[model samples]
Target: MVQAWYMDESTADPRKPHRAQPDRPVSLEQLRTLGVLYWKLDADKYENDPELEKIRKMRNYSWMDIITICKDTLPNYEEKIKMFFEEHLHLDEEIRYILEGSGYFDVRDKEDKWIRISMEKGDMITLPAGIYHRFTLDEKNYVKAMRLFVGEPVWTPYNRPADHFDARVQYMSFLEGTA
Candidate 1:
């Protein structure tokens, strides 16, 4: 399962929880309204997890791979994580399964307020195309994540201040209740 909360405005290390003062929780429904979807699977048996395979078939995810992000496994770990945290949106969906460790994903709500979603082992999250979002690890600064794709994956990021994109336009309509 995933836990979410309004992120406090701060200059502290982004690895911190950054919860709002009152610590209000954001529900999964709220996240879905912003075009985010989630699932919890058996991370321990992921080698040939039936549930995970079912999801891939259901969503037409054709390719999948795993990456380990950590000080040792990732080259330029600090720099790379920093870039991941830079607010951005993709022309295609962003999906990840937390195979090990944990992390945070910050997504913009309808009001554009930053809502931070927490992920741990067994958690799989799908971030629809065009949603403004970013990613980073928790204070532990490590995660083994599975990246999924409907066909081929394109790792392109249209950083914040981008809105003219048709994807963003369609996403806005999606936010406005237009399916």
Candidate 2:
């Protein structure tokens, strides 16, 4: 399971929890309404797990890769971390399944407030296309996660104010529950 709350206004390290006083927790249903999906699975058995396989098939996840982000494992860790922290949107949906360690994913709510979500081991999350979001590893400084792709594995990040993009329009319509 994951935990989410409204972020506090601070200039502290990105890794910190940054939860506001009298935390305003957001539920999974609230996230769902914002086009986010979450699931909890057995990470230890992922390689051969039928449930995970089923999800991949149903979601049309064609390819995937596991990456361990850490000070020692990733080259130019500082640069990549900075990139991840940048508020950006993608033309395609983003899916991540956490295998080990933990991190925080901050997404813009309907009101445009940042809702910080904590993802730990066994947490699988999907961020719909065009959602303004950013990520950072917790104070632990490490997280191993699987990235799932729908077709070709082309990861691209478009920084903020992409509301004119097609993906953004599509996502906006999706929220309004229209065809």
Candidate 3:
């Protein structure tokens, strides 16, 4: 099940500008209303899902790959894991579908409030480009997911000082129902 929450006074923290607390479950439609696109795929039969082609054509996603993370899969786990929790943004939309385990995606809304979105097997989300966000694995710290991209992979993450990016401005407008 997909769940989401908004930042609240009690959870607010300086380091995390959008500190949020668990609020309630949100449907894919609700997320779309907030400018977040979501799709449900059959986790067991992802490669054969006919709808996947439509998604690929719609987003121009021409590349796909599996990303596995865990103590055994990561080298220098301690040094590299922190990066996933550090806030950042991509020049294009960040898209991922959980194939196994679970993870949390923390995103900043139009008001700059933090919204935490949880994903498990079969959940897919396409976060608008330029949205400030971060990800962390659940307690298990294990997740195997599929990452989709439009063109050649360019994984450079523009950390905090990313307001100048045009995509960010457009994403903000999208969240505000103006784009």
User: What C-alpha lDDT values do all the predictions have?
Assistant: 0.92, 0.91, 0.77
Please write out the lDDT profile of model 2 over residues 69-171, one tens digit for every residue: 9998798999999999999999988999999999999999887999999999999999999999999999999899999989888788888978899999999
TM-score comparison, 1 vs 3, better candidate: 1
Candidate 3 wrongly placed segments (more than 4 Å): 7-30
> What are the TM-scores, per candidate, against the unseen true structure?
0.96, 0.96, 0.84
Residue range 81-160, candidate 3, lDDT tens digits: 67877899988878998999988888776567667787889988898788788888767678889999989888878889
Model 1: per-residue lDDT, tens digit, 77-123? 87888789999999888999999999999999988999999999999
Q: After superposition, how far is residue 6 of candidate 1 from its true place, in Å?
A: 0.5
Clashing pairs in 3: 18-114
- Runs off by more than 4 Å, candidate 1: none
